[PDB]
RNA sequence: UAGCUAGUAGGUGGGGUAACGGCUCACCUAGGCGACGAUCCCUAGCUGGUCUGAGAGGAUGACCAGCCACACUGGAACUGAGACACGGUCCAGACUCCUACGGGAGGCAGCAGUGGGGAAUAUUGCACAAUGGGCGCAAGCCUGAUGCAGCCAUGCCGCGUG
RNA sequence: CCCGCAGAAGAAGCACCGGCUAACUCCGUGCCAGCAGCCGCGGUAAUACGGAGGGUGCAAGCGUUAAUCGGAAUUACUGGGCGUAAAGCGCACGCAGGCGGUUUGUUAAGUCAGAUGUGAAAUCCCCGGGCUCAACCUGGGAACUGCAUCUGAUACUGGCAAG
RNA sequence: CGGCCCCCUGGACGAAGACUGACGCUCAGGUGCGAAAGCGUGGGGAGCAAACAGGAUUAGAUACCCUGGUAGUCCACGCCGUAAACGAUGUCGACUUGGAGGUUGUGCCCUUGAGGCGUGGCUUCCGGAGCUAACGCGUUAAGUCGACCGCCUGGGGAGUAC
RNA sequence: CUUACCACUUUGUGAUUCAUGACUGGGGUGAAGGUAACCGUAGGGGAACCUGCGGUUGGAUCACCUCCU
């Protein structure tokens, strides 16, 4: 379940905002080390010392207004060449780009393919992987992340 | 005078051959205590004349077959 | 225990693997940056831990430690790695070696120049 | 069962004189006589004796000096597990000569210091201080 | 990784080789080999040595010297004292190359050097004066062996910066 | 290689200074950060972070990383353990194997002694020689602990024989 | 291993000889035994009792308690082969201060019961030297030695995966 | 010209593997109360926990503010 994350999305948004920054990439797992990764898509380029300025503006912001059972173990991070995109926005911008999208109702012959966008719909994703552009749910999809072709 | 060995017969059941365990009682690498090394050297035996079991003496010869080079000087006991 | 155990199995000597296997006995080895973060120590601190994600030109993708402030590297940067741990942060076996031809050398540093590239300042 | 002679030899002198006992006695046999009398003939024990017919009994006398005993460490070094055998220029010393080594060399078992003079390698039997 | 093996273990006869011999054939026998580890898979050129260690050891096989194996990949012999032959032959293959498209040519793991790989490694030098090697009566010719130089704080040793 | 010339004239740096480990203060600093081989360091005073002075160490180098051995007796042959710290099979019998009382004789395998052969050169080591020294090169030796063979020796082990 | 009795039989100990003549010790592999529970088949069936059944008692009865109660527990014959199967101490031998006991022998001698002397085996407990990190062990050693076997190598991962 | 040999090849037929990769065994996982500990096993079952049998004693928990010879 979203534990309060559009809640923390909001709490975040004010600071990733605040210094201009940008933002994709809410993620939290608790369990031994417990661990949120926040991505900030920095145009002008994702530098750790940009990312300096934007965790402490974040961790002040936070202290306040500390998760529910979410520890305090924030990833400021740049969204790597296998960063993970989510909105369709993403596809927009990411064109006709491969992507490997995981589901979480798995099922024979489910969507968990990886193929190049075509065409990118509000709830839905044209994806070509079975040699065909098939469509794609967002709904069911919990796990998308852009692929760059590598060896 | 001739360099010669001597060895107890494992198996004559080849025609006209012997098979011969000799041992060699050595001073061991690392530790020091001394260990029987046996060799299943192959001996040429004419007559198919001795037994399986017998202690017999050796000498070595220009090869004889795949696997024999040595052919017996004479045999020591008997009567195994 | 009695050497007749020992003609029977001698003393395994014990193996012992490298600390370092990303390395492969190579003092250093390059790699491009794949994605930069700082994270979180837990409550009682704050701070920033400077690790990159790298993969190794031989695929041995792996998290490199990012020593000094300045560095102006970001995704595609091509560093280059070398020994040695840090105690605190786990999953951290290697630091990256500053004055790198990617890395920019930390500015304004007037003492230990050598563990950061930082040329002898002209004077 | 029983398999060495000499060790149960050695350690009867060891567990003797640690029980500060004056003559320890045990099965004789010409290796034990002949160790046994090297160690008179270099003055770690008094003297010793065989008593008995178609008996073998040795009853070695020991001795204290100060109150102190005389042999102080005794260790049989070639054992019937692991024999022991040095070449007269690899005999090895006791204490840097302080000590005595048994050597059984192939004239006649004797000290390592009088092989040396003899020029003969022998296994070693035992060390004594 | 516990069984392994039928030309397989041995014998006769023939052939075959410079020579011994299942080297190979014909037959004969049914053996031989393995827990003293066969077989199998996986790794690896070996040694003098080098490094470390008080020693024993441990690690190692860069340079120099000895031996081995390899020469695009696979296969084959020919010639010759010696080759199944790095700058020899043939066949197959890949690749590169030339073409008149019909076919052809090719083999830097010689010396330089390029590309690439990589954390990273040099000159497309001089000379055959010396030592060597080839051929030759010799003269002499040839020699990327070798002698030298160039490059590099790579190392050792020495010296200066009063 | 020598001779001449001019003139201090053309020629010093890296690391470290909490502990381990030689070498300390001052301001910064505010858990910001950094520092890190570890233990640990850091707030209103921080000899451990930044800077300055001062000092230590090396030095045309100094450091860092890799890597092997050492330290590590931490596979313990030399040279460890197994009541409770890791570690005695649930117990027994028993083949192979390992080991074996006591006396004499024989044997000479073990073993020891000697000898001969071999153990390439270099390398190592000794004693030298040569480069102005040194590295380096070089003479001689030692050494190469091994192997094989012949002669031996017989205490012990083994074998054989009898007890 | 626990009523009594019978039948079958293994092992220990002592006394006193006589007898053979080192015929020994250990044991990888190897066979065998092996608490309880469980399994197969057939039994059997009091008591007891997993599970289960009911009664009692809070988000919820659940657990806790009753009252039942099946399997099982027993037998037969198979199968399993593990237990803190522990003395957390492998087997065999020899040696080394004592005191207290129990227990089973047996010699001697008091008048024998008794009692006094002995001398064995097993076993319990203190404690000397010793050893041990300490606790402790200490002639039944965890002491001083021997022979052989098993076994350990940071914790977790894991006696798990394959 | 033909025979034997045999490289490459091809066909199937397998194995051994090496990867890629769809899929699944599993270390971590996001209150009424009755309390010696344990071991072997069985059952309850989310599992754990408790219970059944038999065995063992190993029959208690916890701990943070400086010196020169
Ligand atoms: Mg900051
Ligand atoms: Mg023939
Ligand atoms: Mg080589
Ligand atoms: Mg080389
Ligand atoms: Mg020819
Ligand atoms: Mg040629
Ligand atoms: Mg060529
Ligand atoms: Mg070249
Ligand atoms: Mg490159
Ligand atoms: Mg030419
Ligand atoms: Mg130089
Ligand atoms: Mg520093
Ligand atoms: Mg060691
Ligand atoms: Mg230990
Ligand atoms: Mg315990
Ligand atoms: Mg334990
Ligand atoms: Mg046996
Ligand atoms: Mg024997
Ligand atoms: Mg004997
Ligand atoms: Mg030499
Ligand atoms: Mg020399
Ligand atoms: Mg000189
Ligand atoms: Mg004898
Ligand atoms: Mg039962
Ligand atoms: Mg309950
Ligand atoms: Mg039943
Ligand atoms: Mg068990
Ligand atoms: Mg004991
Ligand atoms: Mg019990």
Redesign the interface.
């Known amino acids: 379940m979203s534990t309060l994350e559009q809640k923390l999305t909001e709490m975040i948004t004010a600071p990733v905002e605040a210094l201009g920054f940008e933002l994709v990439g809410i993620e939290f797992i608790r369990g031994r080390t417990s661990t949120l990764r926040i991505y900030i898509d920095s145009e002008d380029g994702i530098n750790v010392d940009d990312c300096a300025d934007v965790s402490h503006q974040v961790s002040a912001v936070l202290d306040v207004e500390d998760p529910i059972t979410v520890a305090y173990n924030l990833e400021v991070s740049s969204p790597g060449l296998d960063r993970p995109l989510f909105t369709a926005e993403h596809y927009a911008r990411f064109v006709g780009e491969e992507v490997t999208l995981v589901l979480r109702m798995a099922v024979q012959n489910r969507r968990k393919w990886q193929g190049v966008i075509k065409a990118v719909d509000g709830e839905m994703i044209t994806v070509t992987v079975e040699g065909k552009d098939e469509v794609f749910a967002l709904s069911n999809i919990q796990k998308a992340n852009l692929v760059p072709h590598f060896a | 005078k001739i360099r010669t060995l001597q060895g107890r017969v494992v198996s004559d059941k080849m025609e006209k051959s012997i098979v011969v365990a000799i041992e060699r009682f050595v001073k061991?690498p690392?530790?020091?205590?001394?260990?029987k090394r046996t060799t299943k050297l192959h001996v040429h035996d004419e007559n198919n004349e001795c037994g399986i079991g017998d202690v017999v003496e050796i000498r070595e010869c220009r090869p004889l077959s795949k696997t024999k080079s040595w052919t017996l000087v004479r045999v020591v006991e008997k009567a195994v | 225990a009695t050497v007749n155990q020992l003609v029977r199995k001698p003393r395994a000597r014990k193996v012992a693997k490298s600390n370092v296997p990303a390395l492969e006995a190579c003092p250093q080895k390059r790699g491009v940056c794949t994605r930069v973060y700082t994270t979180t120590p837990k409550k009682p601190n704050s701070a920033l831990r400077k690790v990159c994600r790298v993969r190794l030109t031989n695929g041995f993708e792996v998290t490199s430690y990012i020593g000094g402030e300045g560095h102006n590297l970001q995704e595609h940067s091509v560093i280059l790695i070398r020994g040695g741990r840090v105690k605190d942060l786990p999953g951290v076996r290697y630091h990256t070696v500053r004055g790198a031809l990617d890395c920019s050398g930390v500015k304004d540093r007037k003492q230990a120049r050598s563990k950061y590239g930082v040329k002898r300042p002209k004077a | 069962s029983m398999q060495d002679p000499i060790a149960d030899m050695l350690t009867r002198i060891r567990n003797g004189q640690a029980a500060n006992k004056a003559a320890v006695t045990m099965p004789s046999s010409k290796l034990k006589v002949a160790i046994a009398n090297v160690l008179k003939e270099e003055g770690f024990i008094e003297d010793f004796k065989v008593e008995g017919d178609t008996k073998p009994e040795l009853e070695l006398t020991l001795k204290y000096f100060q109150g102190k005993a005389v042999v102080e460490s005794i260790q049989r070094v070639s054992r019937p597990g692991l024999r022991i055998y040095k070449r007269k220029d690899e005999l090895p010393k006791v204490m840097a000569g302080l000590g005595i080594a048994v050597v059984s060399t192939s004239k006649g078992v004797m000290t390592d210091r009088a092989a040396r003079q003899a020029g003969l390698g022998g296994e070693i039997i035992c060390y004594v201080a």
């Open positions: 061991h690392i530790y020091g205590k001394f260990i």
